[PDB]
Amino acid sequence: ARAKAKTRSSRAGLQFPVGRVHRLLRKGNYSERVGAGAPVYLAAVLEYLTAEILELAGNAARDNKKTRIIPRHLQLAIRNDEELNKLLGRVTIAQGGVLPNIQAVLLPK
Amino acid sequence: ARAKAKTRSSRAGLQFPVGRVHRLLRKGNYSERVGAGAPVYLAAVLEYLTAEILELAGNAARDNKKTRIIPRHLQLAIRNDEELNKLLGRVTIAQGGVLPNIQAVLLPK
Amino acid sequence: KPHRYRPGTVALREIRRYQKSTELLIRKLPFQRLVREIAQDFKTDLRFQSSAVMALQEASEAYLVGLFEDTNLAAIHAKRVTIMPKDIQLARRIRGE
Amino acid sequence: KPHRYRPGTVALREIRRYQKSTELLIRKLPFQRLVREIAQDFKTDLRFQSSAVMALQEASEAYLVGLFEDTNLAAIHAKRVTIMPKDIQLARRIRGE
Amino acid sequence: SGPPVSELITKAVAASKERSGVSLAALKKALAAAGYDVEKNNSRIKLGLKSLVSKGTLVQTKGTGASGSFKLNKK
Amino acid sequence: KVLRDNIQGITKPAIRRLARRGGVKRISGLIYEETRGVLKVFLENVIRDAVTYTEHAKRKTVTAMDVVYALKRQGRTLYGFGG
Amino acid sequence: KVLRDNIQGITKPAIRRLARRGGVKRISGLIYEETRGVLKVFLENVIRDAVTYTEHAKRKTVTAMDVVYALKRQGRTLYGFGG
Amino acid sequence: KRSRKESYSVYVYKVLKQVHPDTGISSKAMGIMNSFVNDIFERIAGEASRLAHYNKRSTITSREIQTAVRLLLPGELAKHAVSEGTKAVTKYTSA
Amino acid sequence: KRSRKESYSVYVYKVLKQVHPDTGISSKAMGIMNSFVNDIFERIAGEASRLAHYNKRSTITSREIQTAVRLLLPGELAKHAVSEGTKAVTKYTSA
DNA sequence: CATGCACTTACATGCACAGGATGTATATATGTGACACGTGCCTGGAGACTAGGGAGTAATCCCCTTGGCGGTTAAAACGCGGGGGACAGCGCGTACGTGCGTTTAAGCGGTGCTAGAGCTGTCTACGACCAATTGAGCGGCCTCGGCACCGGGATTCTCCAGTGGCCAGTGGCGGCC
DNA sequence: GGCCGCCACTGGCCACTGGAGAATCCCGGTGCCGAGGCCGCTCAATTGGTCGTAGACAGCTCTAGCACCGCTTAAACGCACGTACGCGCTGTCCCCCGCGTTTTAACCGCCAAGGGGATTACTCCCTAGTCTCCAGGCACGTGTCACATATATACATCCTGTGCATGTAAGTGCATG
């Protein structure tokens, strides 16, 4: 009578919810109609960027010898990638701190 | 037996088109519904802002003894009102030039 | 003689410390008190989530810190190592306020 | 004896002139050449409405002029009157460019 | 009227006698304390000190020209 | 309940701490009250926006959601508070 | 057919005129080429977006409101050319 | 003939004449005026859409726009705009 | 009794264990990620809506989203995101 | 008669003010086109009705916020030497303003011509919409190991007492006149 | 015999060095509470099918952009040359900083009140949508005076030549050694 339900995220094979993002765009007042591949494309690019920043966070935590990522790792990761840095130059992280950075003449001699 | 076609801008005593702004808000995709008095309020606010900026422009044109509004007068008007300048700090003007500004150290003794 | 560090050494040490550190630098209670004080000026009997106060503290500290890096850029640009009131005034004006 | 103004006098005179004037300070056709050259680096055989080239123009000198009042305030902040590209780098970095 | 600025300068350099020579700002404050309108006579003091340096009566310690420290001759 | 001088509640060593996190090596003595005024002007901007949001919500309880709305409206978006 | 050097089309006297409009009275010689680089950088920053709008419009010819969109995207909103 | 392109010329011309009967207008300053009015309309409309999104409201009322007038328009202009828009709202309420 | 609230925790958890099985996470870092995904989603959606208005297209497709991400995301991030989304929409098209 | 001092006199130098040049400011002339206004029109705003649903409002409760005491220090504050840094002054050597002749290329303007923006019939892909259903995603709970805290070494950096080298000051010596 | 130059000694200053002392990290051990993982629910994502319609395409057109070509003149360009400007040196005062001591209030911990955020229920106010209609503004067209440009004249300003006050140096007569 009816086939087993297969999710569109599974049909794409990506982890972000296609149906949730499509519902958000339907109720977010951006267009009267949305092409079917558009939220899939959105979920894909979101999962790519979250994946890469998670690589950066995991590398930062492993450099800090910590198993779990912290907002300081997020600060250190997001400020040392220039595309990400100017992507979020005006975006602020809770309890992130700052980069270790000292101007040259501040040092002695 | 229809009523005589009267206009909503006249109903609010306004010059800006209530119907055009209402249509733009309906097709601008900002919500599924809009209140009746909301475009009236918006048109009234826009009319007040345009009225004050045109009055400042006319005063500026009178100061430069020209009978017609020039965008130089618009630049002089906007940059000399503090709340307008705070409204339009990041706005680029066509043919505006700048305010006549010389720093005190640039002038000779 | 008693020990005494030379000026700037401890300053550089605490620079390294606070760049390493992540915590808020101002006390919680007087900050919340000042936030309630100034918010009372607009409308009366306002209640505050502690999360809102902490988030405001975070944003304020970050905004101030970025202002001081701009001030540091101005001061090193002015060939000085001591920040000056005209440096903050300049940085605020360059940022567009 | 042939007259010669002292330095800065003529400079301040065209400062007053160009602050009074609104007309565009850039030769139009070399600017159009530069626009087409840079545009060809992204897409070949691009064609331009002349109004688009104009809009790009006033956008360009708006950014450039505002940069120069920023750098001028930086330079007098540095107790100097001659601008140097370090001032421009300072202004770009403080603006977050 | 009174004496010229040269007696004032040599009195300023003979007043203190540190290991290093007296400086421009120190001698200006010395003449301000002794009584002289130093604010309009900066060029006067510069030319007087440079002329008296050329006489060999004063030797400039570290600086060059009118800057630096200034001290009296051997004898 | 009614308080007056809590701009002085941002103490001078706290400003020194912020400066050391900001990489300032030396601070003039005139700096602290200026920075107090600056953080003030900033804060009534943001809380005026927050109060406007809160009264629009028909609430007298200020939420951090309103705060992050106010900060991103000034182009100063903050992460980590439910946005 | 191709172009190789038009950055020198922004001549030193034109830059001097702009700095006089900027209120600069004295200009070092090192200024001009560095400012050429800065203005150039601004140019690809706007024109990459402009090309993106143009191709997304499926047009081959650049139109002005696309430049308007790109500039207000960069917070540099231009008046007098919309529509 | 071509397609109709709506513009703001007539309305701004009327308000210009009622604030200054004596003066004239240049058309490229009028292009600036179209850009200005469209810009502010877009800003306030986007802010109102954000506010209705936050309060889960499907309907934009004048309360939302009035709130946005507090948000964007600075200070004394905002109190003035509340005054004129409020009395205009009452007048339209009286049809 | 409570009300269900949306968050993106579990999908980011699958992504994290996909990219780093050995690496944990703090919950406030997840709050920062939730602000991240909501903010970037809102940016792309607003850009897509304004682009859809610019060409008067009442439907936003993956072409529009591609245009928007090319606008906002710079270069290397842009080209790899384009590649990932292109592969995703292709394998969805085969599905 | 010589010599120091004071007095007088001449010259160098900084400051002030008049005078010309000149670029900008101020007065008509004009002819032009941008601006402003009359006109056809059609399409977009408005009038009447409807349907239905989103928002306004009552009730409640509970959870979150507010209000209050008391140790407990860390932190704030105060004070004080004292080094380090802002900053004034000057010299000075330059690089850039200013001026002027040249070349060039920017601009005007005029023709030709075409890609291509853009407008309009068509029809179909596609996407929103409605009924069902479920399983994945979220509330709840538990527990446990990553992680916070602490204490003892090891390290590490840094500042300060000696440490020798260098340079100039200084006295003594030998030769010379 | 005294004077002068030379030579050798010596003291102070400046870069080098080892060690001490305090800060900082690191390693090991301990508890402790958020991560996260499992369990139960539910609601919303999916499936399927339909209707309508959005937009891609075909095709056409006319228009604005691109090219070119000649003229012209101002702008750029480049060289000369003076001057003012960065800026490095030196120094000098004084301003925060490190290092303590006192103080104080922040914070944590705990406890009680209640208030309004939020949630559900009910309702009806309002507004999107549809049909009809007509007039408001827009494109088009066309006259017309505001002003851009041109020309003649006035004044502000700016540099500069000259004239004055003042500081300084030199000569010399006179009183005295």
The resolution of the experimental structure, rounded to one decimal in Å, is 4.3
Place of tokens 């030797």: E59
Which residues neighbour H89 within 8 Å (Cβ) at sequence distance 6 or greater? Answer: B12, B37, B40, B41, B44, H62
- Tell me the backbone φ, ψ of residue I25, rounded to 5 degrees: -160, 145
Structure tokens at H92: 């339209």
- In angstroms, the CA of C8 and the C1' of J144 are apart by 46
SS3 assignment for chain I: CCCCCCCCHHHHHHHHHHHCCCCEECHHHHHHHHHHHHHHHHHHHHHHHHHHHHCCCCEECHHHHHHHHHHHCCHHHHHHHHHHHHHHHHHHHHC
Q: Do chains I and G touch (3 or more CB pairs under 8 A)?
A: yes
- Report the residue of C19, C77, C80 to disrupt the A interface, i.e. the one with the largest count of A CBs within 10 Å: C19
The beta-strand segments (E) located in D1-97 are 47-48, 82-83
Which chain I positions have a beta carbon within 8 Å of F77's beta carbon? 39
Helix (H) or strand (E) holding A35: none
Cα distance between residue I50 and residue B32, in whole Å:
17
Structure tokens at D24: 């565009």
**How far is residue F46 CA from its own chain's centroid?**
7
CB atoms near residue D80 (< 10 Å): 14
C-alpha distances out from residue B84 to B20, B100, H44, H73, Å: 25, 18, 16, 9
> CA nearest I46 in G: which residue?
G73
From C95, D24, D92, select the one nearest G34 (Cα to Cα). D92
Nearest C-alpha of chain D: how many angstroms from B92? 7
- DSSP letter (8 states) at residue D49: -
CATH numbers and ranges of domains, chain A: 8-98 (1.10.20.10)
Which chain F positions have a beta carbon within 8 Å of H71's beta carbon? 49, 52, 73
Question: Measured between CB atoms, which of C11, C41, C60 is closest to F42?
Answer: C60
Beta bridge partners of H24: B68
With residues binned 3-state (H G I as helix, E B as strand, rest as coil), the percentages for chain B, rounded to 5, are: 50, 5, 40
Cα distance between residue C65 and residue A96, in whole Å:
12
The answer to whether the CB atoms of A92 and F81 lie below 8 A apart is: no
Which residues neighbour E68 within 8 Å (Cβ) at sequence distance 6 or greater? Answer: E21, E23, E24, E60, E61, E62
Within an 8 Å CB–CB cutoff, is residue I59 touching chain A?
A: yes
Cα distance between residue G37 and residue G43, in whole Å:
10
Which chain I positions have a beta carbon within 8 Å of A23's beta carbon? none
CA torsion angle for B32, B36, B37, B39 (degrees, to 10)? 60
The answer to whether the CB atoms of F80 and A95 lie below 8 A apart is: yes
Strand K close residues, chain H 40-69, CB < 7 angstroms: 59, 61
- Classify the phi-psi angles of C80: left when phi > 0, otherwise alpha if psi is within -120 to 50, otherwise beta: beta
Nearest C-alpha of chain B: how many angstroms from I92? 29
- Classify the phi-psi angles of C96: left when phi > 0, otherwise alpha if psi is within -120 to 50, otherwise beta: left
- DSSP letter (8 states) at residue A4: P
Cα distance between residue A28 and residue A21, in whole Å:
10
> CA nearest A106 in C: which residue?
C81
Place of tokens 């591609």: I66
Structure tokens at D93: 């970095």
How do beta strands G61-62 and D47-48 pair? parallel
Indicate the SS3 state at residue C79.
coil
The beta-strand segments (E) located in C22-63 are 47-48
Q: Using the CB atom, is residue D9 less than 7 Å from strand K?
A: yes
Cα distance between residue H89 and residue B57, in whole Å:
28
Q: Are F22 and F46 in contact (CB under 8 A)?
A: no
Which residues neighbour D90 within 8 Å (Cβ) at sequence distance 6 or greater? Answer: C73, C74, C77, D71, D74
Q: Are C86 and F34 in contact (CB under 8 A)?
A: no
- Class of residue G31 by CB neighbours under 10 A (exposed 0-12, middle 13-18, buried 19+): buried
- Class of residue C39 by CB neighbours under 10 A (exposed 0-12, middle 13-18, buried 19+): buried
The answer to whether the CB atoms of G78 and B94 lie below 8 A apart is: yes
String of b and e for B11-35 (b: at least 16 CB within 10 Å)?
bbebbbbbeebbebbeebbbbeebb
Q: Are B31 and H60 in contact (CB under 8 A)?
A: yes
Question: Measured between CB atoms, which of F52, F55, F69 is closest to H54?
Answer: F69
* DSSP, residue by residue, E34-74: H---TTS-HHHHHHHHHHHHHTTSEEE-SSSTTSSEEEE--
Q: Are F68 and C56 in contact (CB under 8 A)?
A: no
Which residues neighbour C16 within 8 Å (Cβ) at sequence distance 6 or greater? Answer: A100, A102
From H29, D51, I54, I50, select the one nearest H8 (Cα to Cα). H29
Q: Are G17 and D17 in contact (CB under 8 A)?
A: no
Planar angle of CA D71, D73, D74, nearest 5 degrees? 60
Q: Are F19 and F27 in contact (CB under 8 A)?
A: yes
How do beta strands E69-72 and E22-23 pair? antiparallel
Cα distance between residue F56 and residue F68, in whole Å:
15
- Class of residue A109 by CB neighbours under 10 A (exposed 0-12, middle 13-18, buried 19+): exposed
- Class of residue F53 by CB neighbours under 10 A (exposed 0-12, middle 13-18, buried 19+): buried
Estimate the crossing angle of helix I27-54 against helix I62-72, to 10 degrees.
Answer: 110
Q: In residues, how long is chain E?
A: 75
Within an 8 Å CB–CB cutoff, is residue D8 touching chain B?
A: yes
Q: Are B94 and G80 in contact (CB under 8 A)?
A: yes
Structure tokens at G61: 């010819």
Q: Which nucleotides of J are covered by protein (CB under 7 A)?
A: 14-15, 21-25, 34-37, 43-48, 54-56, 64-67, 75-77, 82-92, 95-100, 105-107, 115-120, 126-129, 133-140, 146-148, 158-161
- Class of residue G25 by CB neighbours under 10 A (exposed 0-12, middle 13-18, buried 19+): buried
Q: Are F82 and F64 in contact (CB under 8 A)?
A: yes
Cα distance between residue B105 and residue H67, in whole Å:
45
The answer to whether the CB atoms of G80 and B71 lie below 8 A apart is: yes
Cα distance between residue A82 and residue I15, in whole Å:
23
Q: Are B11 and B22 in contact (CB under 8 A)?
A: no
Cα distance between residue H43 and residue H39, in whole Å:
6
Nearest C-alpha of chain D: how many angstroms from B4? 45
Question: Measured between CB atoms, which of H50, H64, H71 is closest to F49?
Answer: H71
From B8, B16, B21, B74, select the one nearest B47 (Cα to Cα). B16
> CA nearest I15 in A: which residue?
A51
- DSSP letter (8 states) at residue B109: -
Find the nucleotide nearest H1 (Cα to C1′). Answer: K139
Indicate the SS3 state at residue G27.
strand
Q: Are C89 and D72 in contact (CB under 8 A)?
A: no
CATH code, F1-83: 1.10.20.10
Q: Are A65 and A73 in contact (CB under 8 A)?
A: no
Place of tokens 């304004």: I50
Helix (H) or strand (E) holding B62: helix B37-63
String of b and e for E2-16 (b: at least 16 CB within 10 Å)?
eeebeebbeebbeee
Which residues 16-45 on chain H approach chain B with CB closer than 8 angstroms? 16, 18-20, 22-26, 28-29, 31-33, 36-37, 39-42, 44-45
Question: Measured between CB atoms, which of B29, B30, B32 is closest to A31?
Answer: B29
From A64, A81, A75, select the one nearest A100 (Cα to Cα). A75
Indicate the SS3 state at residue C82.
strand
> CA nearest A24 in H: which residue?
H53
How do beta strands G26-27 and D82-83 pair? parallel
Beta bridge partners of A92: F78
Structure tokens at D52: 């688009």
Beta bridge partners of A69: I25
C-alpha distances out from residue C80 to C46, D45, D78, H84, Å: 45, 52, 10, 52
Indicate the SS3 state at residue D78.
coil
Cα distance between residue H66 and residue H85, in whole Å:
8
Q: Using the CB atom, is residue E1 less than 7 Å from strand K?
A: yes
- Class of residue I67 by CB neighbours under 10 A (exposed 0-12, middle 13-18, buried 19+): buried
The answer to whether the CB atoms of F79 and I36 lie below 8 A apart is: yes
Cα distance between residue I34 and residue B101, in whole Å:
47
From E29, G83, F50, select the one nearest H4 (Cα to Cα). G83
Residue type, A62: R
Which chain D positions have a beta carbon within 8 Å of C63's beta carbon? none
**Among 1.10.20.10, 3.30.1600.10, 3.40.50.720, 3.30.420.10, what is the CATH number of H1-95?**
1.10.20.10
Question: Measured between CB atoms, which of H5, H7, H35 is closest to G79?
Answer: H35
C-alpha distances out from residue C4 to B13, C8, C82, E22, Å: 78, 12, 22, 32
Cα distance between residue B42 and residue B50, in whole Å:
12
Evaluate the CA torsion angle A49, A52, A58, A60 in order and state its sign: negative
Which residues neighbour D50 within 8 Å (Cβ) at sequence distance 6 or greater? Answer: none
